Symmetry: D2
Subunit: 169 residues, 4 copies
Amino acid sequence: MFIKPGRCPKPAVQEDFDAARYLGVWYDIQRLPNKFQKGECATATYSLSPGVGFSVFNRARLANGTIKSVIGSAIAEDPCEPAKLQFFHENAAPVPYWVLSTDYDNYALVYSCINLGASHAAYASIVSRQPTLPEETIKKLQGTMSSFGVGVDTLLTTNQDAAYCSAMN
Amino acid sequence: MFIKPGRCPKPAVQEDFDAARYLGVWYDIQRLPNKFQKGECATATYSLSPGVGFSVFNRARLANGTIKSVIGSAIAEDPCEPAKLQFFHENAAPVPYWVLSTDYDNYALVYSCINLGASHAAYASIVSRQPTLPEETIKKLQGTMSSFGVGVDTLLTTNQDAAYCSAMN
Amino acid sequence: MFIKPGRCPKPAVQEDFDAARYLGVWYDIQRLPNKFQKGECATATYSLSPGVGFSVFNRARLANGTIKSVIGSAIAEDPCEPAKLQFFHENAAPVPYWVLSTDYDNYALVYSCINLGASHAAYASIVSRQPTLPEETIKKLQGTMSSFGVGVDTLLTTNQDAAYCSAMN
Amino acid sequence: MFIKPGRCPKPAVQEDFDAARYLGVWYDIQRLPNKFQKGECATATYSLSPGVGFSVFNRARLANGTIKSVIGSAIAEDPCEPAKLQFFHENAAPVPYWVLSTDYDNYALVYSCINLGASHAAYASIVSRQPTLPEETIKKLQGTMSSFGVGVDTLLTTNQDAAYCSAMN
Ligand SMILES: C=CC1=C(C)/C(=C/c2[nH]c(/C=C3N=C(/C=C4\NC(=O)C(C)=C4C=C)C(C)=C\3CCC(=O)O)c(CCC(=O)O)c2C)NC1=O
Ligand SMILES: C=CC1=C(C)/C(=C/c2[nH]c(/C=C3N=C(/C=C4\NC(=O)C(C)=C4C=C)C(C)=C\3CCC(=O)O)c(CCC(=O)O)c2C)NC1=O
Ligand SMILES: C=CC1=C(C)/C(=C/c2[nH]c(/C=C3N=C(/C=C4\NC(=O)C(C)=C4C=C)C(C)=C\3CCC(=O)O)c(CCC(=O)O)c2C)NC1=O
Ligand SMILES: C=CC1=C(C)/C(=C/c2[nH]c(/C=C3N=C(/C=C4\NC(=O)C(C)=C4C=C)C(C)=C\3CCC(=O)O)c(CCC(=O)O)c2C)NC1=O
């Protein structure tokens, strides 16, 4: 995660967030540097749960070409704030997952922040329904991140090159 | 939930709890009074989840013969404490669910407590793999409940009459 | 605490809340029924703390003329939300304390809610800098309470009779 | 804080922890590397609170000779676990503080852990009533830390040199 001074901000989340339209495959496009990051080509696949919330299956391509995957469950602990989710990954403690912005069909902006006293740890990701996203959409989502203090200059562009990422197919 | 003096106790939970063996159908036998309890003939069905934890489907027979059902998800937030679950029901805030004692094939004793300052609210339930449970097992589980301050003569016996409950089939 | 259907509401809190001006003595005027309420003539005294937040000293007149007192600490866990405090009483688990409305020199409306699955438990109190408060102010604060579902005809009027309460002096 | 893979461990805390005997001045002797650490010569001063818990005043000597200090409040949220404290520092989010071991008159071992998904952030400190502690006591407290996975090889010895730390007097 990205660690820096200050307490977690509380940005606005997506209004009338509809988890049913958020299901399916998302590609990782851009994100904060992540000390724990294993790989490239990252996707998140969200699916139906017979309980509440939805199920999570994330996949990434390690430098050696091995695919690393993790399974999880996503639940909105407050049903009146359906965009403020808790993610329960196998063998992980619970972490927050906030959908700050999505149009369901093209893009989403996700934020996770955990307080560490007078510092905090964050994930922040731009994702896409495709392995790329238009520069115009990226710049708008970067504008949203700068409005709660994310340094857009620090964001890393994920490797989604078709040949490099072919091991994912 | 039943409101009583004192902060939540912390009873011992089932050693080496195995959620796989805990899945399937449980019948409500006896429980604490519950002001918003709907119905009798109550069952809990626990099933596989494609993410973490397991999925919850509870059913009860309302007075006019309708079956009320609720969907939920159960997750052990700490995998080293697998008998201390959080239940996430549609339309409810998270509640704890502690498996105090089970032999998986006959009985379980479950407890849930939320602190209210110097007072608390609790659920406590004896459940069975059949619509009845032997008196000797009920008595042993009442003894466990009395060891952390549950009053035995508050417990209600659930109506599990085969004719009254036949709408459940 | 008073148990009712529904999950906790989230009423608006006092803008620009200034704990320094909120210190000193407050008299209980009206509150929700409270099964473990001890006494009448209730006052809350808030004082400086050498750490963060402020210190709490609550007093009430028991039926046999003894004064019951409790010590606590109040901390706003998020300094950007200074009217959303946590109160830590001797012998109690943490409880929320939200200053919904105050003019610092006459009245305050305080609210505390804890979720119990699909139901909740709450405290709600109208307090005054004097042992009485004008009817017009009581009526306005009842209107605020009714806007998030408090039933006005549940509220109890605290005994603040100068002769009955004289043991408090 | 020190960040590494895995979830927070839950080590045993000091039995019958008595906050009254823990009050006064403690010197920082040894601790985990701390990405947020400002200075050397660190002391913690714990004092009476008119509310619950105790008040905190920490001081350290920066490389330029300026003294940095912070104020805080310490509260045990569960009165039955008085060694498991929450520390509320001015402008910080709440952080845990566990007294793992103390004899009140010579030494204490303190641990703080916050989960970051499949990693965690920790503080771990050996403190003393004096600017030094016997090697025998340090080695015993290091044994306690190794028993829940702390790498004693990573611990840093705090500069408590009388001449360097004279700016603290
Ligand atoms: C932004 C919020 C965000 C959260 C809450 C998050 C948490 C998170 N992601 C994980 C894995 C993972 N997370 C991803 C990918 C994603 N995960 C996503 O939330 C998204 C949007 C993607 C990208 C498409 C992958 C591929 C893994 C497994 C490999 C790895 O650990 O890097 C893990 C578990 C690590 C483990 O088991 O070792 C956590 C706790 N990651 C995030 O980026
Ligand atoms: C002891 C722990 C215990 C917990 C944590 C618990 C929680 C719990 N049970 C619920 C419903 C329900 N719970 C049950 C039944 C059960 N529920 C069970 O956990 C068990 C063991 C049974 C019985 C076999 C049923 C039938 C419903 C739906 C009907 C109703 O609302 O009463 C709800 C939601 C109510 C709503 O949406 O209005 C909560 C929060 N109930 C408990 O009894
Ligand atoms: C509305 C929020 C509200 C909160 C958070 C609250 C909590 C609260 N009040 C308590 C006691 C008490 N609380 C009060 C009085 C007050 N307490 C107040 O917060 C206010 C505004 C007054 C009144 C002026 C008194 C007199 C006691 C001690 C007597 C008693 O236990 O009833 C206790 C501890 C009980 C014990 O140790 O047994 C709690 C948890 N009370 C509330 O009314
Ligand atoms: C081991 C638990 C432990 C906790 C919970 C802890 C938390 C903690 N210590 C802080 C400051 C501080 N903490 C210390 C010192 C100490 N603090 C102590 O808990 C102890 C035992 C000492 C040492 C004697 C000092 C001197 C500061 C202020 C200067 C600095 O930020 O380094 C801050 C606030 C930083 C700020 O306002 O910028 C936090 C959150 N530090 C810890 O070491």
